[PDB]
C-alpha cells in the first residue's frame, strides 16, 4: 500500500517468545515473495528512534547529474587538399547515451524512462605542434551548433547555405563565454522512451534488431563560423547531458560483463575473474576460507 516515507523506520523493544503454532523465522521462497521476518521476531531488541534521511536515493537525485556523452577533436585550417573522411572545420553527431559506460550502465537499470534533457557544450583549443610553428596565442572563435531532426538534411560544408537556419534552432557562442546551455523537451512519439527494445524497426525481415528510431533524440551539427587563419589549430568539443523531471519503470539486473558496441548488448567478458563469462566474483581457495581474516598477536 502506497505511503510517504522521509526517514528510515524505528525499532521497538521486545521480550522472550515461546508460542506453539507461530514460526516467524520460517518462510516459503517458492511463492516469489521476499521474507517478512522482522528484527523484533528474531532477537531481543531495545527501542530506537531513527532520524536517518532517505532523499539521496530518490530517482531524480540518482539520475540527475551532468555526464559526458560526446567528445570530438578536429583541425581548424585551410582544408583545400584534405581527404574526404576529414571533419573539414565542421562535424555532425547523432545524439545517443550509449558511447560512455558510466551513464549507459545507470540508464540500463530501468526498462522505460521519461525525462527532459539539459545539454551543456564545452570547447577548448590548442596550436598545432608542427616543427615550423612557435606558440602564437589562442583565438576567441565563434561556433554555431544547429539541432536537426532524425534523418533530415544536414550541411555538406563549412559555408553551405543550409546554415541559414530559417526554422531549425541554432545556438551561437564564443570560446571566452561560460559553456553554452539549453533544454530539449521529452520528444518521444510514445509516453516513455524504451531503454531496451525486443523487436525490429520495419515491416520487412532485413531491419536492425534492438534499435527503435522513435527513441533517437536527433542530430547535432557543429561548425566554426570564422574563416580559416594563416596557421592551423586543433579544436575539441565536449557535450554533457543532465536528465530532469524523471519517471522510471520496471527495474532490471545490472550489466556485469564489459560492453562491446553501441549498436547491441553483445558480450565476451574478462580473461579471468572478476567479470569473466564463467566467473563474476573473484575466487577463494575453499567455501571454508575467510579472505580478510583478522590475525591476533
Amino acid at each position: 500500500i502506497e505511503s510517504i516515507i522521509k526517514t528510515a523506520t524505528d525499532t521497538v523493544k521486545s521480550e522472550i517468545n515461546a508460542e506453539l503454532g507461530v514460526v516467524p523465522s520460517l518462510n516459503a521462497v517458492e511463492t516469489g515473495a521476499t521474507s517478512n521476518t522482522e528484527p523484533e521476531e528474531a532477537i531481543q531488541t531495545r527501542t530506537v528512534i531513527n532520524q536517518h534521511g532517505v532523499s539521496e536515493t530518490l530517482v531524480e537525485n540518482f539520475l540527475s547529474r551532468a555526464a559526458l556523452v560526446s567528445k570530438r577533436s578536429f583541425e581548424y585550417k585551410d582544408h583545400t587538399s584534405s581527404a574526404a573522411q576529414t571533419d573539414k572545420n565542421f562535424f555532425k553527431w547523432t545524439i545517443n547515451t550509449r558511447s560512455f559506460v558510466q551513464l549507459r550502465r545507470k540508464l540500463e537499470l530501468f526498462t522505460y524512462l521519461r525525462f527532459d534533457a539539459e545539454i551543456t557544450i564545452l570547447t577548448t583549443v590548442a596550436v598545432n605542434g608542427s616543427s615550423n610553428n612557435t606558440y602564437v596565442g589562442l583565438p576567441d572563435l565563434t561556433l554555431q551548433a544547429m539541432f536537426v531532426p532524425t534523418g533530415a538534411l544536414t550541411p555538406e560544408k563549412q559555408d553551405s547555405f543550409h546554415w541559414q537556419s530559417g526554422s531549425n534552432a541554432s545556438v551561437f557562442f564564443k570560446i571566452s563565454d561560460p559553456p553554452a546551455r539549453m533544454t530539449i523537451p521529452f520528444m518521444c512519439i510514445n509516453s516513455a522512451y524504451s531503454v531496451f527494445y525486443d523487436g525490429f524497426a520495419g515491416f520487412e525481415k532485413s531491419g536492425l534488431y534492438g534499435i527503435n528510431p522513435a527513441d533517437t533524440i536527433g542530430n547535432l551539427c557543429v561548425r566554426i563560423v570564422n574563416e580559416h587563419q594563416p596557421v592551423g589549430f586543433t579544436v575539441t568539443v565536449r557535450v554533457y547531458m543532465k536528465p530532469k523531471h524523471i519517471k522510471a519503470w520496471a527495474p532490471r539486473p545490472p550489466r556485469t560483463l564489459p560492453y562491446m558496441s553501441i549498436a547491441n548488448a553483445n558480450y565476451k567478458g574478462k580473461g579471468r575473474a572478476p567479470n569473466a563469462l564463467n566467473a563474476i566474483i573473484g575466487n577463494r581457495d575453499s567455501v571454508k576460507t575467510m579472505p580478510h581474516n583478522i590475525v591476533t598477536t
Binding site: E2, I4, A33, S55, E60, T183, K244
Partner: peptide, 30 residues
C-alpha cells in the same frame, strides 16, 4: 526557485516526491 521562461519543461529539477510502495516488488502475491 527562479524561472522566467514560458515553457514549463525549462524549469529546475523536482526532488520532493517521497511516496513509495515496495510491496509491488517484494510481495507480488494474491
Amino acid at each position: 526557485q527562479i524561472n522566467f521562461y514560458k515553457d514549463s519543461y525549462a524549469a529546475s529539477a523536482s526532488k520532493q516526491d517521497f511516496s513509495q510502495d515496495p510491496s509491488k516488488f517484494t510481495e507480488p502475491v494474491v
